[PDB]
């Protein structure tokens, strides 16, 4: 469990560092910044690389919503959930701290005024979207993310390709939802930067712990009840694929 | 069949949500929008991830043109075609509806005036291209898409790599054809947004049901008649690869 917790902590640290640092240091650079597309690519690549690196150790969740959705899908023991979550959160926080230090090396940096890549809705949405839009988008994208994770790791899916699918799914989610809420779908990532923003981000933090997790659960349930093959169905397929 | 229909519906929902939402919410964002390249990447990633997730269940078509072209290529039973198509369409519509709701959360949104990422030609083409250009581009790109799908899923192709090839092919198709017609090559995706546009999009909708499907058929025929190896050819290759 120590190995697994260390893997989850390092993975979440990598995710937060990569994505949030790309957003804070490079997204708005004059005449050469990477923009929203670059930020989405960075977020996807963090998960892809860290999955390839330590998924064989811990399973590569790096997300409390992912862990809880996998539990709801019947794929992860309940007794191990809490530990995982704690590790993830801790990792994120550490990353944020280091990021803060780095961001302080440039004149004029102000975490409170810039927002420090914090998630928000309504008046604090990047595009000025309402609370209902944020709720709908977060729910749908979390459910889709969990569905993709469940499908790609199924025993009948191509072996070894899951990290690519999951990382590119995260990139797509960011590409879709950055203008609405800043694309959290990850409570630990939201918390890590909300702590250092210190203002309105902490007031709205609860929203990004409830909506993603709920969405993840829904995703798991769907794959558990509508898409996964039952034991009898597996046996039937095996018998139907026998030469005669 | 219920599992397969659910998989197709969810896949088409994912495709429409991802691609059209990226086009509507993030493509034109000031100073940080993702642009045409970002939209093309999102469209490709939706198909890639959904294929990795549920292709082992339903085959991962998510496109009426793909289903009909696979039928014409001798790879999909006719009696199952209609069901698939219906599922796909339904999925798309649902996605569009949710997208509409989300788009309504920002002040000044107007689906009719903006076009809601609808496909069009002539006066309604993004780049002001004529009907003939739209016809030629849609035909060629649909044929190429079906050819790629047939080749990548061939029993002699590398195993497990088909989703990557198909998704990146869709991304390339968008990169090429977005300025001409908005890159439909998918009747369900066109219908989903044309319904909510409610104006000229419905007048031109027929064009994007006929041209793609026909193109797909052509693609299938080509692979069926010029590229697929016959039974005798397979036996000859097997015998030619025997040690002596």
């Amino acid at each position: 469990m120590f190995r697994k917790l260390a893997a989850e902590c390092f993975g979440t640290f990598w995710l937060v560092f990569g994505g949030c640092g790309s957003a804070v240091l490079a997204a708005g650079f004059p005449e050469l910044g990477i923009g929203f597309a670059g930020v989405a690519l960075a977020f996807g690549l963090t998960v892809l690389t860290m999955a390839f690196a330590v998924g064989h150790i811990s399973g590569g969740h790096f997300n409390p919503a992912v862990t809880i959705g996998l539990w709801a899908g019947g794929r992860f023991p309940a007794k191990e959930v809490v530990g995982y979550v704690i590790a993830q959160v801790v990792g994120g926080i550490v990353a944020a701290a280091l990021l803060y230090l780095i961001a302080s090396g440039k004149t004029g940096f102000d975490a409170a005024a810039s927002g420090f890549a914090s998630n928000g809705y309504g008046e604090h949405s990047p595009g000025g979207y309402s609370m209902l839009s944020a709720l709908v988008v977060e729910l749908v994208l979390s459910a889709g993310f969990l569905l993709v994770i469940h499908g790609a790791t199924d025993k009948f899916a191509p072996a070894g390709f899951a990290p690519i699918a999951i990382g590119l799914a995260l990139t797509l989610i960011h590409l879709i939802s950055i203008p609405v809420t800043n694309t959290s779908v990850n409570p630990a990532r939201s918390t890590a930067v909300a702590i250092f923003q210190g203002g309105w981000a902490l007031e709205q933090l609860w929203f990004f712990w409830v909506v993603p997790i709920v969405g993840g659960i829904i995703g798991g349930l769907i794959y558990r009840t509508l898409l996964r093959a039952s034991r009898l169905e597996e046996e039937l397929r095996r018998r139907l694929t026998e030469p005669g | 069949m219920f599992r397969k229909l659910a998989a197709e519906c969810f896949g088409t929902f994912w495709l429409v949500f991802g691609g059209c939402g990226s086009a509507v919410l993030a493509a034109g964002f000031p100073e940080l929008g993702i642009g045409f390249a970002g939209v093309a990447l999102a469209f490709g990633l939706t198909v890639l991830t959904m294929a990795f997730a549920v292709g082992h269940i339903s085959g991962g078509h998510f496109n009426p043109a793909v289903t009909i072209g696979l039928w014409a290529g001798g790879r999909f039973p006719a009696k199952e075609v209609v069901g698939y198509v219906i599922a796909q369409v339904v999925g798309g519509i649902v996605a569009a509806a949710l997208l509409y709701l989300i788009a309504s959360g920002k002040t000044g949104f107007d689906a009719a005036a903006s076009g809601f990422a609808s496909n069009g030609y002539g006066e309604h083409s993004p780049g002001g291209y004529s009907m003939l250009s739209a016809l030629v581009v849609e035909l060629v790109l649909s044929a190429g898409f079906l050819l790629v799908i047939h080749g990548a899923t061939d029993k002699f192709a590398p195993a497990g790599f088909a989703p990557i090839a198909i998704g990146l092919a869709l991304t390339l198709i968008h990169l090429i054809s977005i300025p001409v017609t908005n890159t439909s090559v998918n009747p369900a995706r066109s219908t989903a947004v044309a319904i909510f546009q409610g104006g000229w999009a419905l007048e031109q909708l027929w064009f994007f049901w006929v041209v793609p499907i026909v193109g797909g058929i052509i693609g299938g025929l080509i692979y069926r008649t010029l590229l697929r190896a016959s039974r005798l050819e397979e036996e000859l290759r097997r015998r030619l690869t025997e040690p002596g």
């Epitope: 009898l232 169905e233 | 219920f2």
Partner: nanobody, 122 residues
Framework: EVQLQESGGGLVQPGGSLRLSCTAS???????????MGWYRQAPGERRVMVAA???????MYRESVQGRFTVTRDFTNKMVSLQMDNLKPEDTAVYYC?????????????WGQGTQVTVSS
């Protein structure tokens, strides 16, 4: 135990169609709803292999070489399973058995029918 009674089948020229039916008895509807109902076939000198089935959740499954020509239907209330064969070929000549698969946690149990002859000769 479960008792399976089949019907239909016989002689048909190539390109014709046939409909086999099978009914179960000696089992309650609720108990049968948790089982899979399908069709096996044995051709002269070969294996007895499954060609089509309907699972406890109503999902129709087919063998690759027969999908597109065979249609398997299940009536849960009537405890019935039927198979419709269209565009028959010489390779379809065989003895067809109604089959029931039951899940016993650590293994599966098979219930077999009497068998019906299907001969496709021009």
């Amino acid at each position: 135990e479960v008792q399976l009674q089949e019907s239909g089948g016989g002689l048909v020229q190539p390109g014709g169609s046939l409909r086999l039916s099978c009914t179960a008895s000696g089992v309650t509807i609720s108990a049968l709803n948790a089982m899979a109902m399908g069709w096996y076939r044995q051709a002269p000198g070969e294996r007895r292999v499954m060609v089509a089935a309907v699972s406890e959740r109503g999902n129709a499954m087919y063998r690759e070489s027969v999908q597109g020509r065979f249609t398997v239907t299940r009536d849960f209330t009537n405890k019935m399973v039927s198979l419709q064969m269209d565009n028959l070929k010489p390779e379809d000549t065989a003895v067809y058995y109604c089959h029931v698969l039951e899940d016993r946690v650590d293994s599966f149990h098979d219930y077999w029918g009497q068998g019906t002859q299907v001969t496709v000769s021009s």
